[PDB]
């Protein structure tokens, strides 16, 4: 409301200065207005806000009115106007008027500008109230900050130094008034008088982006930083500090910031410790930070001398850590690969910081958040996160992360490790990439839902990056860091059985290169059966027996190719003893039996007088199955087992010729028939029929003579008379109808 | 039809032999691309699963041969398309690779084409018998039993005829070639 | 109160009575005193107890008073003295007056006792009220007790019948008031009646004493029983009718008794079913049983009553049963033993009882619990149940229980047969304790030995008591017994085993006096293969092979022993074939073909033929077992297939030696050797190449010219080479080096 | 020490072939008599274990020639008294016995007294190799064709020492006879 009236009476007077202004003659009338409206920002009951906008309204139409006089000037004159100015009643007014005609007069009269700009400058220290003096210095600023006696003056009255000191003592004079304005109103309103401080620090700022387009370095020197520092330490307030510290690094140059560093740490330390040099400190390295992230042993001489700072103070250890990541930020980004002083922030920080850190607990901590962005600074920072792995150190302060965050942190960085398609870990790689599994792994639904697909297919890679016998020594001694217990190996180990296939034949393909590559087979063989033996610690497991079937098969192939064929056959007597041992569900055990039966069916390097044994085995303990169907099926295929089939039939030891034993063929033949026969039901034991009857006519077609035709017509009687005479019709039926349909036209 | 893509990939054997889709290949079988992926298996994991899951709005899945911890998967499953009907397994609840017991097998299940991923783990293809055999080798690379081509294919039903298209990352360096196959079902 | 206020005045009068009974001449004043006394006898206020003592007290004061009179009698008299006192007011004490004067009128002058004796009793007609006549009575008894004229009599006149007058019409008179005090009195007082009439039972029953104190047997039967039963077949009262013949039969002697059996057994047939007879009879044959266990045609009259008892007492289940139970045990008390008795027993008494039990279902029930006491009645009382077995009809009853019942007493009686041995059983007493196994066995922790099995190893044990011909007929007839099923034979039958070779031998040990021995092997031995056919059929358990393998394994043994090999080779290529078709655990297998092997070692008479077949069949089976260890084993033991060790390795070229086939032995150890190389274990298999230089030490010494002291001399070097270089130490390499020491302190 | 008697019997078939021990065996064998008793198993019956362990404070039961389902058990138990190590058997395992084959079998187990009861089951005794052999003979006196009174043994060992007392039912009527043998391991 006092804002609304006082604007009020601003529009007022201003729509009479302009027809004033409109009319020669009239000037002295719009002045004498102006000075009633100026009036107006005599008040010191606005609110600061307030204040502000009465000051913008009567600041704009003082440009009108100082745009008037500065074209008067330029195209008549007007006489004595400068003193003419000084005979207005009201002070604020008249000051206003001083200063407008003073930018008039500048602009007609370059002979007196020392004079009258050090007079307008000299007589602006009468006002005695801090914000509209500051405001009055705006107006002076708008009108003559762009004047100054400076450079352009080529030899009469001014210089470059002449507008450094106008500056300089235009800074005392409102730092002494940002000082006072703390202290103006009464003690209780300290917030709201720092708030409006908050919001006057532009103008002091503004002379500082005046003084940026001035002297160069020595000069900077000499007589702009060398000023302003004694000021800056000695206001000993904390708005200006950091603000003005801030304005003065970003506007002006840092070549002349550079030249002055150790000036500026000098100020840094000539602060009270009771100003907010924590918030100065940050802000100060965080610039810095700046001055490392935008893509003089500096590092030495800001590292140890912000370790004395920190010194000098006692500091919370959040900040201290803060200070810290800023610390590696700027070591990051100014040294990535300068190992050197990497490892000295790894050292030169972080035993310092135990000591320091009063080490409770510490996840939730923003120190801690810190922490990790310092440890993220180097993974972040590196092209080869293999230089972390370079700092002896880097890795083991790792364990003296606390221990949540050891999880959050170490996890985070591997799987980073992981995204990477990353390079060879050499064993010294190795050894790191490691015992960050092992804090990993130890001490021991996976609300985790880590690690190994991509974690196992990675490893497995990066391990045949290394030499492949040492990839053998790696992996055992990795076999036993995996002493983590039952619920890993399983999904673990098989890819390691087969970064031991690639070993396996990585020796063959040495094999007339070496002949201890058959020994180095049998030494892996060795660990086969050792590591196998480990599993079967693990006896709670489903699939631990197919498993392991599986891995006896193909280590009994690779055995073949290794010719290191000794340690097969005891491999799958071994899996018998799986056999044994594994008999918990009776469809489990039809379908693992028959898995058994298809390995077999690969199973290609037993000599003749081991694999028929083998084969009968295979074919008793199929006969000591539960029931008849299964039976069935299992007997038809031991017919497989000795005929024109299967893979094991074109074997390394068959060299894909065909066992062909037709006469025993025959007899697991009508063996089959005569289960079938027992089946007692009609349509399931005639569609067995007619398929054991298109079996039959494999082997006639294979050329089985023990299957004859006279037992294909035998067969296809007892089918027509069951399959008509004795079926009740049914889909099952129709199709053993269409099955025996389709049997006769392949027999012709 | 087809409005409606079906892909058929093989020999994965993850992390059996092989871990991954080539990424050029995840790309062309990327989500939105497929809305029917039939994998024959070994994936082995519910990671695997949701991932297969997502790539597109309808996947059927059979038993797998290492995959014998998922006991409440279907072992065997027929597709219907227009008038072609479509059985898929991949081998283990067969009995082995012989041409008849292959046509016995087709006979009961009322299916026309066949794919199968054996040890070979290398892209295959031939019709015999009127019916349509298809391996589409590794879909990872797979190792083979054999003495390599990653591949795998998308099939194309319209009424009464099938079109296999295969893709393959083929050797000269790694190139995606595709190649185009078509099967009609016997009247 | 009242009594003993009563008492006071009858010890008063007492005192009175006396005090004049000191003077002669104050006797009607002693009597007027006395009569006061008595004249307390009228209240009837007083309980039946203290009525009763109020009657003692009066009692012990007529005590004094009869001394008095039976005093002065002696001394001077009073004429008419039994008129006179006759004058007195009061009834009662003018009665008991009466009977104190006419005893001692019996003591003065015994000439009128008889006659008076006839008065007195004349006048006992009138007290009519129960307890008042009865104590008044009971005085009389008293009173009159040494006088009476009989055979016994003290010298009055009169004869038996007198003193049979004075004594029945004396317990008419007193059981008519004894009965009449059921009723008089108020009818709310029935049980105070009981009460009454139990009190005063003994005053009814001292003349049967007094009776029994008099006339003898022939005066018995005419002059008591019938009195007395026509008072018991006509009171149709309960308590009397228990009491009166309670007390007859023990008052008078059973030697009377027996003279009047037919009188009491006429009695015994009208007993009517809603009188308390039960308990009547219950007391009376239990006395009977009693009788008969102090151990006239008593048995048939008896008998044929209790069948006239039986129709006229019809009772609830469980006391019918019991009612039996007690006939049973004076059945037993009677006749258990004598057949036909026996058989009587059976049909007429216990078929007639489970015809007449029209029973409700009762195992549990006490009618069971009875019936079973009954039946255990003839086991108890049969001594010699061997006797009660003596009855072809012994089963006979066992038709008759229920099953469970029959299957409870059976198993009870089994039982009862292992406590003891039970005799040389002939060949029908073997058929009728198999009709008792049948019902044990069928329908059906066996510590119990259940049913059987303990039992069945006595059968066969029992089986030895008789000779071959008589076994062979006892051993068919049990297996025929033995149509059991498949979960019973299998405890049951190895026994038979035995049995059938201990006839088979028993057989032999006829060869010179039947050569039909080899026929009656051959009939024994078919029999025998039959049975275990039988076996074969029932493979539903474990053992099933192992018991049909050791018992075709015996009966060949058996057929070597008797030299009937011919049967031998077949039930051993059988046998073989139950290892083929049966058998498949591996270490189960292990074990059947050590067994084997070891049978073999007890293998000699087979025609070489046969045996050199079965020698080289067996040498196959040991190369077709499953395990390399296991294959180790079997080779080395095949090679005493053909060592000098074991029996199996006598041919019959060999002359008593063993085949000593030192080359065959070698080429057996040589393939030991080629299975121990690739056995891949470095200790157990240097132990073994230690065990088996052993045996090649062994097998030099028991002459085999193909092991040489050089093949042990270098392969000692080669144990030294192994055992220091390459054995990692364990119990097993010291046990090692100590067997390889001993090695060569065996080679010297 | 007589503290610790040792029951050495065999050849059972309870009831697989007879009834009992004799009576006097019975109360020879009697609780409060033996400390412990080595039995050879193939009982068959229950209540035999369990009056068998109720003869002695201890029980110890190896696995029989008849026992092929409670195979758990060893066939054979070491005990130790001052110096002594302690094998006992019956003896199928072994293929021949002559002087090499308890020898061998004496340095497999490294003991001092070797215990066996063979299917001839008659008694005999030798002192062999610084070691002790003893057959207790046919105890219960089960019978077969092979080339018994019945009897049974005590034994006690003390130290290096044992003593053996052989209990025989002897025939003239049946007359128990007994014996005792003393046994000190050799140095």
């Given at each position: 409301r006092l804002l609304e009236d006082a604007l009020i009476a601003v529009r007022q007077q201003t729509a009479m200065m302009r027809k004033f202004l409109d009319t020669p003659g009239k000037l002295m009338d719009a002045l004498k207005c102006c000075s009633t409206l100026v009036?107006?920002?005599?008040?010191?009951?606005?609110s600061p806000k307030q204040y502000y906008e009465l000051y913008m309204a009567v600041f704009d139409a003082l440009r009108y009115l100082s745009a008037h006089l500065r074209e008067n000037h330029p195209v008549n004159h007007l006489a004595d106007l400068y003193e003419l100015v000084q005979?207005?009643?009201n002070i604020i007014p008249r000051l206003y008027l001083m200063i407008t005609v003073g930018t008039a007069y500048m602009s007609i009269d370059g002979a007196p500008v020392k004079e009258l700009m050090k007079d307008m400058m000299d007589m602006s220290r009468?006002?005695?109230h801090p914000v509209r003096g500051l405001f009055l210095r705006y107006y002076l600023s708008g009108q003559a900050r762009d004047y100054?006696?400076?450079?352009?003056?080529?030899?009469?009255e001014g210089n470059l130094q002449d507008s450094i000191n106008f500056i300089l003592t235009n800074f005392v004079e409102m730092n002494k008034l940002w000082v006072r304005l703390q202290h103006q109103?009464?003690?209780?309103?300290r917030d709201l008088r720092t708030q409006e401080r908050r919001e006057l620090q532009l103008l002091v700022g503004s002379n500082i982006v005046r003084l940026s387009q001035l002297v160069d370095l020595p000069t900077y020197r000499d007589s702009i930083l060398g000023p302003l520092l004694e000021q800056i330490v000695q206001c000993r307030d904390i708005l200006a500090q950091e603000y003005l510290l801030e304005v003065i690094t970003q506007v002006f140059p840092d070549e002349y910031h550079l030249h002055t560093l150790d000036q500026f740490l000098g100020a840094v330390s000539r602060?009270?410790?009771?100003?907010?040099v924590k918030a100065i400190v940050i802000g100060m390295m965080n610039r810095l930070s700046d001055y490392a992230e935008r893509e003089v042993p500096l590092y030495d001489i800001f590292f140890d001398q912000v370790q004395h700072l920190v010194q000098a103070q006692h500091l919370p250890i959040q900040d201290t850590i803060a200070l810290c990541c800023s610390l590696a930020n700027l070591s990051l980004n100014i040294?990535?690969?300068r190992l050197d002083y990497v490892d000295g922030i790894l050292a030169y920080a972080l035993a310092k910081v135990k000591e320091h850190a009063?080490?409770?607990?510490?996840?939730?901590q923003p120190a801690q958040q810190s922490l990790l962005s310092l440890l993220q600074s180097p993974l972040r920072r590196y092209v080869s996160i293999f230089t972390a792995l370079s700092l002896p150190t880097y890795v083991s302060l790792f364990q003296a992360q606390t221990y949540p965050t050891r999880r959050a942190i170490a996890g985070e960085i591997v799987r980073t490790l992981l995204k990477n398609q990353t390079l060879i870990s050499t064993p010294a790689h190795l050894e790191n990439v490691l015992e960050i599994l092992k804090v990993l792994i130890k001490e021991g639904?996976?609300?985790?839902?880590?690690?190994?697909q991509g974690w196992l297919a990675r490893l497995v890679h990066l391990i045949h990056s290394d030499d492949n016998d040492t990839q053998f020594r790696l992996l055992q001694m990795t076999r036993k860091a995996?002493?983590?217990?039952?619920?890993?190996?399983?999904?673990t180990t098989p890819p390691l059985i087969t970064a031991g296939l690639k070993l396996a034949r990585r020796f063959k393909a040495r094999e007339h290169y070496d002949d201890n590559w058959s020994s180095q087979s049998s030494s892996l063989f060795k660990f086969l059966h050792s590591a196998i033996s480990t599993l079967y610690?693990?006896?709670?497991?489903?699939?631990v027996a197919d498993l392991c079937l599986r891995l006896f098969c193909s280590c009994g192939q690779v055995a073949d190719m290794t010719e290191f064929e000794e340690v097969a056959y005891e491999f799958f007597a071994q899996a018998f003893t799986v056999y044994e041992e594994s008999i918990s569900d009776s469809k489990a055990q039809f379908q693992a039996v028959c898995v058994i039966a298809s390995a077999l069916h690969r199973?290609?390097?037993?000599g003749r007088e081991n694999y028929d044994t083998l084969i009968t085995k295979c074919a008793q303990h199929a006969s000591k199955l539960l029931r008849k169907p299964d039976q069935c099926r299992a007997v038809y295929l031991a017919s497989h087992l000795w005929?024109?089939?299967?893979?094991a039939a074109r074997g390394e030891t068959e060299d894909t010729e065909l066992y062909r034993d037709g006469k025993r063929v025959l007899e697991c033949l009508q063996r089959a028939l005569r289960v079938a026969?027992?089946?007692?039901e009609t349509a399931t034991s005639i569609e067995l029929f007619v398929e054991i009857l298109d079996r039959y006519v494999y082997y006639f077609d294979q050329?089985?003579?023990?299957?004859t035709t006279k037992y294909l017509n035998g067969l296809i009687e007892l089918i027509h008379s069951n399959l008509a005479g004795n079926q009740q019709d049914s889909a099952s039926v129709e199709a053993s109808r269409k099955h025996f349909i389709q049997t006769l036209e392949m027999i012709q | 039809s087809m409005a409606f893509l079906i892909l058929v990939i093989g020999?994965?054997?993850?992390?059996?032999r092989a871990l991954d889709i080539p990424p050029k290949f995840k790309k062309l079988l990327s989500?939105?691309?497929?809305?029917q992926t039939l994998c024959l298996g070994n994936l082995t994991d519910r990671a695997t699963y949701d991932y297969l899951r997502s790539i597109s709005p309808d996947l059927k899945i059979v038993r797998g041969r290492?995959?014998?911890?998922?006991?409440?998967?279907?072992?065997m499953q027929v597709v219907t398309h227009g008038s072609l009907r479509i059985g898929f397994l991949?081998?283990?609840?067969?009995?082995?690779?012989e041409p008849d017991v292959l046509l016995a097998e087709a006979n009961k299940l009322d299916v026309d084409v066949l794919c199968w991923a054996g040890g070979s783990h290398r892209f295959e293809c031939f019709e015999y018998m009127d019916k349509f055999f298809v391996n589409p080798g590794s879909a990872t690379g797979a190792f083979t039993t054999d003495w390599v081509v990653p591949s795998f294919c998308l099939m194309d039903v319209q009424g009464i005829s099938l079109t296999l298209y295969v893709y393959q990352l083929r050797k000269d360096t790694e190139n995606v070639a595709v190649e185009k196959v078509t099967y009609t079902k016997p009247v």
């Open positions: 009036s107006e920002l005599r008040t010191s009951s606005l005979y207005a009643g009468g006002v005695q100054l006696p400076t450079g352009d003056s080529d030899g009469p109103g009464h003690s209780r309103e602060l009270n410790p009771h100003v907010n040294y990535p690969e009063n080490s409770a607990d510490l996840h939730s639904e996976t609300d985790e839902t880590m690690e190994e995996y002493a983590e217990g039952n619920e890993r190996i399983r999904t610690t693990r006896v709670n497991g489903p699939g199973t290609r390097n037993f005929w024109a089939t299967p893979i026969d027992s089946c007692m050329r089985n003579e023990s299957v | 020999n994965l054997h993850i992390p059996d989500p939105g691309k497929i809305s290492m995959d014998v911890e998922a006991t409440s998967l279907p072992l991949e081998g283990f609840t067969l009995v082995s690779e």
